[PDB]
Amino acid sequence: NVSGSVKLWVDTTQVPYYKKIVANFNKKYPDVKVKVTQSPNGSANAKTDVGKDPAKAADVFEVANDQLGSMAEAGYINPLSPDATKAVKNNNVAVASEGVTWKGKMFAYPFAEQAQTIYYNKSKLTADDVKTWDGLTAKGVLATDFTNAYNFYPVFLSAGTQLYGKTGETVKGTDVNSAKGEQAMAWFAQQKSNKGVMQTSNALNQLKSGKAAAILDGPWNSANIKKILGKNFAVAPYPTIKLDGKDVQMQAFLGIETFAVNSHASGSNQKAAATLASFITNKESQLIVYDHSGQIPVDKTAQKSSKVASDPVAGAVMTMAKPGNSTLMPKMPQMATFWNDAAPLINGAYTGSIPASQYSTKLDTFVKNISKA
């Protein structure tokens, strides 16, 4: 029987109901003593939080899929056993299992998925309005931010190019320095004169003021947007956009929320740690997490619950999560330079400081920058 003393880092709004999840856990594993604490700087800084001093970090910690490569290559996490891989794969959607996989091996236990969508004031735009970018912008104003590469780099993916290859693990596999790359660049550029697109550093403000009919955002802000828009609150997946003369799904990044085991934590509690991670991301837990936080489960049989299949937000996110509609954010370390260089590239296209004659040159430099050995 599994026993031990384990420390669990979860985020904010979540430590209370994980104790409820732990309360369910400690039924079959009563001898495993859990201390549910807040991760110091959130799950978004997990690699850093665990990194600062691995020995004193929690045994199980919340972390996003875009950090698993860094943390694995730093030696903070051991790969999952074949058996543990079999279970994760058995129970969750494919893109979640692919999400936790780095160099062919799993490094975490997934439980939720996220992806940005459209939120719109439906007294200003109809459901049919928001199916195409151009149709939408012709009727209502969409407030967004072109200095945000999290917002707009996936347009390159919509154009048919790839980020570090199809798997996202190919160092010089980014192929955006081509004619399809320039297409997306020309798309950014046309948005400037689009009288239905407002550049703003706070899109929520323009939705709050009513100067915008729609915004792009992920499910972490849905409740926040509901209170703002009230009766006129509506949500839908990204629209199609026009590239290469044809209409294609506008993509967003896909994120998988997970729990990983600290390989630098106390040895005798490592078996208990795996047990806690495995459990707190199971089918029942995911709906408890959903009940409280609204987060969208990756469990196949949990996504089918009427509670999840009534949620407009869950619907749009799960639709975005389908292949072709989103791409998992790469784990490559070179993403650090990407985040520095993607926004200047995208916004230079939009504002026009990068001219059309220099798209092919500036895309060459970008690929060169982010593909360094």
DSSP per residue, 188-239: HHHTSS-TTEEE-S-HHHHHHHTS-SEEEE-TTSHHHHHHHHGGGEEEE---
Q: Which residues have C-beta within 8 Å of that of residue 322, sequence separation ≥ 6? A: none
Question: For residues 19 and 36, is the Cβ–Cβ distance under 8 A?
Answer: yes
Pairing mode of beta strands 4-10, 246-249: unpaired
Q: Which residues have C-beta within 8 Å of that of residue 3, sequence separation ≥ 6? A: 29, 31, 32, 272
Question: For residues 6 and 34, is the Cβ–Cβ distance under 8 A?
Answer: yes
Alpha carbon distance 91, 300 (integer Å): 6
Alpha carbon distance 189, 183 (integer Å): 10
For 202, the token pair is 């706070």
Instruction: Name the phi and psi angles at 40, rounded to 5.
Output: -50, -50
Name the DSSP class of 92: B
Beta-carbon neighbour count of residue 83 at 10 Å? 7
The dihedral formed by the CA atoms of 43, 46, 48 and 54, expressed in degrees to the nearest 10: 140
**Alpha carbon 328 to its chain's center:** 7
Resolution of the deposited coordinates, in angstroms?
1.7
Beta-carbon neighbour count of residue 155 at 10 Å? 25
Q: Is 328 helix (H, G, I), strand (E, B) or coil?
A: strand
Pairing mode of beta strands 214-217, 117-121: antiparallel
Q: Which residues have C-beta within 8 Å of that of residue 238, sequence separation ≥ 6? A: 116, 117, 118, 216, 249, 250, 251, 252, 320, 325
Q: What does the longest C-alpha to C-alpha distance in the chain come to?
A: 68
Q: Which residues of 202-236 are buried (b: 16+ CB within 10 A; e: fewer)?
A: ebbebbeeeebbbbbbbbebbeebeebbeeebbbb
Name the DSSP class of 59: S
For 61, the token pair is 């910690």
Taking phi over 0 as left and psi of -120 to 50 as alpha, with beta for the rest, 256 belongs to beta
Pairing mode of beta strands 60-64, 4-10: parallel
Alpha carbon distance 8, 341 (integer Å): 35
Question: Among 126, 143, 142, 122, which residue's Cα sits nearest to residue 134?
Answer: 142
Q: Is 54 exposed, middle or buried (0-12, 13-18, 19+ CB in 10 A)?
A: middle
Of the CA atoms within 13 Å of residue 360, those in its CB half-sphere come to: 3
Question: For residues 232 and 22, is the Cβ–Cβ distance under 8 A?
Answer: no
